[model samples]
Target chain A: HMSARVRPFLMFQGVQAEAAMNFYLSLFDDAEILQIQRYGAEGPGPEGSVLKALFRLGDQSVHCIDSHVRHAFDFTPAFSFFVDCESNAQIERLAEALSDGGKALMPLGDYGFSQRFAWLADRFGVSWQLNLAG
Target chain B: MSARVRPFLMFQGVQAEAAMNFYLSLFDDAEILQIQRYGAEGPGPEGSVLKALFRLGDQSVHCIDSHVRHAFDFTPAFSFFVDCESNAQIERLAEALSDGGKALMPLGDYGFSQRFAWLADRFGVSWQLNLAG
Candidate 1:
């Protein structure tokens, strides 16, 4: 039997952690910021940048942090947040909102499985796949 | 509105897709729902998977075959967090998943997590298999 609720832990560079989390919080309906730990004068990111933060995105617990190091890898389309859209309106609205400053991979249309589907990398470089479920 | 937030592993060594299939095969309930491949026109090694989606025991995930080799690869920063039930289950899954890959922590009680292991699977996709209470 399946036991854990798998969550994607994302790492963002520098001071973008708070902004990125706030941006995502705006998109999800039942979102909540659970706990947050910020960096201080000892210095990693800026004085107030998020060192470690936990938040709920539609009930799933997502953890994120602002990395002091910039690894060669940033977020990739390979790993995306896949959503099952419930209504025609949500599919359209989400598609529009998420793709604002991002690059669209698969434009919304009939992708065989779902009636409407859109995949894009959010402005913060996070990838998302929205699918209108049957 | 409880929704989707899951691990998406990217492939570079090609073993990422292979390991995903292994994961599906390891669990009877797992499944591969969709796949999109690259044709002759563009990306690396035509016929190789460009990107795909799958599930294991009810969890949804995504994976891809890079069109071109990117300098970056999977990092432990983002990892698959699996809450395992039994000690036997935890050890078995941990061993099989991280078979030839690297182990950030061996199978044991790390105190922080009862019986957990953090590892990079054969595909280099990092995973955190935590034993459930």
Candidate 2:
């Protein structure tokens, strides 16, 4: 039996972890911010900000944290989420919502490789590729 | 039902297929589901992977070799978080992944989990290994 598990882990600078998780939850009907643990007076991070959280979007369980240490780097498109959308409409909605304050690398269209596809990074600096599937 | 989400990795050159093979060899019940390679064309190097899909146990991952030379590469801001079943499994994976790569966090107890370590593979892809129970 398969006992090990893998999930996407996201690290956020400042305190946008919770906001990003909530924003993602809003975009999907079956999404939820399942659990959150905030830093206490220990002060590795902001006392009231999220230290760690588990969120679900679609069929994926995503882990995130507001890093106490500020790194020079942030999210990159080299690593992203490939979303399998059921319909063109779903792709459209997700693309629009995800790329609202962000940028789109590829607009929604048939790119010969897929019936419908779009690649964009969300406002939180997380990238997503939405593809329409049968 | 909701949409399915899988982790995507974009490689700079021909490392896509090799990386897929490396990951597949690390776990049980893993296999390459699909692969599309570029032909003798203008975009990417001939025979390089255009897109590929693979699975590591129950987790599916999509990978590609990008034609464009993006200004950025993989960062620890996003990683593949792995939950290992035992100390041995976690130790094996942590050593294998961090062999030629940098260890962000050395394997040890960090309070958040029983045992944990973070590392970036030789290809610059990041991973987090955690052992619980």
Candidate 3:
């Protein structure tokens, strides 16, 4: 009776949901946009904008939406994700990709705690902490 | 090589351990795998969580107590969506989580789902408890 599961849900501004999902899917292996529902002419948001979507990132499943309303708060580093990468090259590439249109909170380096780690936010302001692991 | 993604929670105050414990108590399939506390010469309280790893249901989550004060806290912009199995489960979670916090959406049949409730826990972490339709 207890088969419940919890996953991260992202709410993007206006119409960036689909694009952001695509960008993320391109950066990860075993990733894909599982499903998407767009707002039609009778939209609470702009027509053709993403109403909601589901995407798979490696072993994780994520839910996202293009919010029709703007809120006072946006994505912050307080709530982020940890990516356990299998190689230095993988973490390095992810850091570069995420840092291109975003800001790196911590550059790729041995932080003592982690041999190879990098922290950054994507273009959509979602924070990610990439770490090299065996 | 492929990577795995896990949710991370950065507690603004020294609520990391307490929050994690509370979560463990709430979810049937939950446990703390590991935890590291701050040292004497530290940025956070000596006993505060420097880092913690825990499992809730099937997800492995990482949490830590923040040393530096941040400009922001957790928001509904990104939330933990719980796919509940029954009405009792959703109700129980909703009431427990929203006890000290507030509800974003009250528990009810919300058209989209069988029954759903969105709330922020006492620690300001957002959760969407949904009984799938």
Per-residue lDDT, model 1, residue B81, is: 71
lDDT of 3 by residue, A44-65 (tens): 8899899878898988889999
Query: What TM-score, computed on C-alpha atoms, does each candidate reach?
Result: 0.67, 0.91, 0.93
Model 2: share of native contacts present? Answer: 0.81
Report the C-alpha displacement of residue B129, candidate 2, in angstroms.
1.0
Residue B40 of model 2 has an lDDT of 88
Candidate 1 residue-wise lDDT, A1-134, digit = tens: 34444556777876787888888888878888899999889775777888778887774677788988776667766556777777778888888888888878777888885688888877888878887875
Residue B30 C-alpha lDDT in model 2: 90
TM-score of the second chain, cand. 3:
0.94
Query: B16, model 3: CA deviation in Å?
Result: 1.1
lDDT of 2 at B119: 90
Clashing pairs in 1: none
Classify candidate 2 by CAPRI docking class. Answer: medium
Clashes of 1: 0
Weakest ten-residue segment in model 2 chain A by summed lDDT:
A1-10
True A-B contacts kept by model 3 = 0.82
